[PDB]
Paper text:
E76 hydrogen bonds directly with the isoquinoline moiety amine of papaverine and noscapine, and through a water molecule for (S)-tetrahydropapaverine. Alkaloid binding leads to the ordering of β2 completing the Bet v 1-fold. Alkaloid binding and subsequent ordering of the β2 strand causes C59 to be buried. Noscapine and papaverine showed the strongest binding affinity to all tested MLP/PR10 proteins in ANS-displacement assays with IC50 values from 4 to 126 μM and 42 to 493 μM, respectively. Notably, whereas ITC results suggested that a single MLP/PR10 protein binding-site could be occupied by two alkaloid ligand molecules, crystallography data showed that PR10 −10 bound only a single ligand. The size and flexibility of the binding pocket do not exclude the possibility that two alkaloids could potentially be accommodated. Crystallography and ITC results support a 1:1 and 2:1 binding ratio, respectively, which is insufficient to accommodate the direct binding of all accumulating BIA molecules. Our discovery of structural features unique to alkaloid-bound complexes, including S-S bonding, inform future studies regarding the nature and possible contributions of specific MLP/PR10 protein domains and quaternary structures.
Numbering used by the authors:
A (entry chain A), B (entry chain A): 8 to 33, 37 to 51, 54 to 113, 116 to 156
Write the structure that this text describes.
Amino acid sequence: GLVGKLVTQLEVNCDADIFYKIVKHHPNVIPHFFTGVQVTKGLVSGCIKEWNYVLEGKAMTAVEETTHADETRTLTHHITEGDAMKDYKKFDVIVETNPKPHGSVVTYSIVYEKINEDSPAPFDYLKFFHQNIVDMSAHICS
Amino acid sequence: GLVGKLVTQLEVNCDADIFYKIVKHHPNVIPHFFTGVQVTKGLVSGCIKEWNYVLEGKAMTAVEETTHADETRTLTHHITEGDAMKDYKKFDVIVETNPKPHGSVVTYSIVYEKINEDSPAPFDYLKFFHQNIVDMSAHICS
Ligand SMILES: COc1ccc(Cc2nccc3cc(OC)c(OC)cc23)cc1OC
Ligand SMILES: COc1ccc(Cc2nccc3cc(OC)c(OC)cc23)cc1OC
């Protein structure tokens, strides 16, 4: 099948709702910048960004639309164009934060559909997003 | 947190129960061998294997105990010793096969606890297990 999902899940010592608000509004362990716009539904609900970035040494671009759901503490990043779309027909990244039954569990999911069987699965992106949330989490404390 | 999980999930065009039986009883895109024993509860329920294998060029060993649950089509591989335990206090690999709401969805989950913050997350194992189930799946058809 061309269809799959990669996940990295990490425990964080931080209340879920506060951690979601931190991630929602938040650096450069990678060369990167973006231009773009915010989206409203007159309050900002999301954004559309064109990113320029370097992954594993290679410069790339991507157009990303981000939406959020405060009730479920979920952020959704929907990629519509760029280098990744040479490999994937569909590429979405869903970030979920839930309390432990303390602190919380953060899940990054990359939901993808390959263009064909020769396409790689997005382990490079999984590692990138993983190291990004590890770094962010290591700059927060009690 | 030192605690996390990595997942790779793939769709396969194959009934779930049959695919589980295939995985349960099943090669060498990696240098590897094992010695070990089978476990009974007088019917074999599992196995305990000492593996010798090469991952990303480096020879390694691991002691693995495998159990299965036919009712949930789940295989559990519990690592008790070897090279990975220099990095992880706990390392388990859970393989689940479920029908799509056709064919099925296979999930490999690596549930880990790092020894300390300097330990890597097991992306190397995730890619290995991923490429192994992709290869196996590509030798099955209608
Ligand atoms: C091709 O895949 C992507 C490429 C870039 C992004 C951009 C992005 N979104 C959220 C957080 C990010 C965090 C980043 O690091 C700070 C970053 O640098 C490239 C890009 C980020 C998202 C992507 O997937 C949603
Ligand atoms: C350190 O982690 C492991 C190392 C080796 C294994 C051994 C193993 N179990 C199941 C399927 C396997 C499939 C393999 O490839 C055919 C293989 O080669 C190293 C080892 C396998 C399992 C492991 O985790 C469960």
